[PDB]
C-alpha cells in the first residue's frame, strides 16, 4: 500500500506555542522522520508528502526557503534509511534546492523496502498545463498510460491523511489516484501522536 501525507497546521502550531515559524517547521521535520517510522511499522512501502503547493512558491523567497529547508533537512539526515525521490512543478523551485535534492536522491539507499517521495509545487492546473506544454506536438495520441508516466504522482495512492483540520483537498489531489481514501485529522501536524495515526488507519 502507498500513503500520501498532507502535513498542515505548522503556522497555527507555532503561534499556539509562542515559537517562531522556523521552529514550527523544525518541529515538522522531526515528526516526518518519526511519522515515517510509524509508516514503516504498519506496512507502508511508499509515503508521499506534499512538500508544497504551487502557490506556496509564489511567496517571497524568504518564506519559501524556510519550508524548503526543513523539508530538505529531513532528507539530509536520514537519506540512508530509504529510497528518496521528488517530483512536481520543479520549474518553480530554486536551483539551490533541486541541486541539493538531486544530490540527496542519488546518495540514498537505492534498494530499501521503503521510498519517501516529496511532491513540490502541487497544483492540478500546473501539472496538467505543464504536461500538455511538454508533450504538445510530439505525440500522436495521448493515452492514459502516457498520462500516468508524466503525472506528478507516479504511483497510485491508497490512503491520504490531511492534518490541520481543513476538510478540503486544496492543490494536493493526486491526479491519477481517484479511489484514494481520505482521512481528515484536526490536530496540527507538529502535535500528531501515534494515537491519531493509529486512529487514522482504523478506517475500513
| Residue 173 near a second copy by CB under 8 A | yes
Strand partners, 46: 2, 115
Burial call 102-117: b when 16+ CB within 10 Å, e when fewer: eebbeebeeeeebbbb
Q: Which is nearer to a second copy, 131 or 201 (CB)?
A: 131
CA separation for the pair 93, 163 (Å, rounded)? 24
Given a contact cutoff of 8 angstroms between Cβ atoms, the answer to whether 174 and 15 are in contact is: no
Among 62, 139, 195, 202, binds a second copy (CB under 8 A): 139
CA separation for the pair 87, 67 (Å, rounded)? 16
| Residue 185 near a second copy by CB under 8 A | no
Among 123, 163, 185, 192, binds a second copy (CB under 8 A): 123
User: Locate cell 522522520: which residue?
Assistant: 33
| Residue 143 near a second copy by CB under 8 A | yes
Among 95, 141, 195, 202, binds a second copy (CB under 8 A): 141
Query: What is the contact surface with a second copy in residues (CB under 8 A)?
Result: 123-126, 128-129, 131-133, 135-137, 139-144, 147-148, 166-171, 173, 175-176, 178-183
Amino acid at each position: 500500500t502507498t500513503l500520501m501525507l498532507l502535513p498542515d497546521g505548522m503556522r497555527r502550531w507555532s503561534e499556539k506555542n509562542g515559537v517562531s515559524l522556523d521552529d514550527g517547521y523544525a518541529a515538522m521535520g522531526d515528526k516526518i522522520i518519526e511519522f515515517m517510522g510509524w509508516a514503516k511499522e504498519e506496512g507502508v512501502k511508499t509515503l508521499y508528502i506534499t512538500a508544497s503547493s504551487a502557490a506556496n512558491h509564489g511567496r517571497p523567497e524568504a518564506a519559501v526557503n524556510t519550508f524548503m529547508e526543513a523539508f530538505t533537512e529531513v532528507i539530509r539526515r536520514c537519506h540512508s534509511q530509504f529510497k528518496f525521490d521528488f517530483s512536481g512543478s520543479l520549474d518553480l523551485v530554486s536551483e539551490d534546492y533541486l541541486t541539493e535534492l538531486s544530490a540527496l536522491r542519488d546518495k540514498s539507499d537505492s534498494e530499501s523496502d521503503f521510498t519517501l517521495h516529496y511532491i513540490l509545487g502541487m497544483s492540478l492546473s500546473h501539472e496538467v498545463v505543464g504536461i500538455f506544454n511538454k508533450l504538445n506536438g510530439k505525440i500522436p495520441e495521448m493515452t492514459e498510460e502516457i498520462l500516468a508516466e508524466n503525472a506528478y504522482v507516479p504511483t497510485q495512492v491508497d490512503y491520504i491523511i490531511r492534518t490541520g483540520g481543513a476538510i478540503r483537498m486544496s492543490s494536493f489531489f493526486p491526479l491519477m489516484s481517484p479511489y484514494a481514501e481520505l482521512h481528515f485529522s484536526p490536530v496540527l501536524f507538529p502535535d500528531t501522536t501515534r494515537a491519531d495515526f493509529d486512529a487514522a488507519l482504523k478506517d475500513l
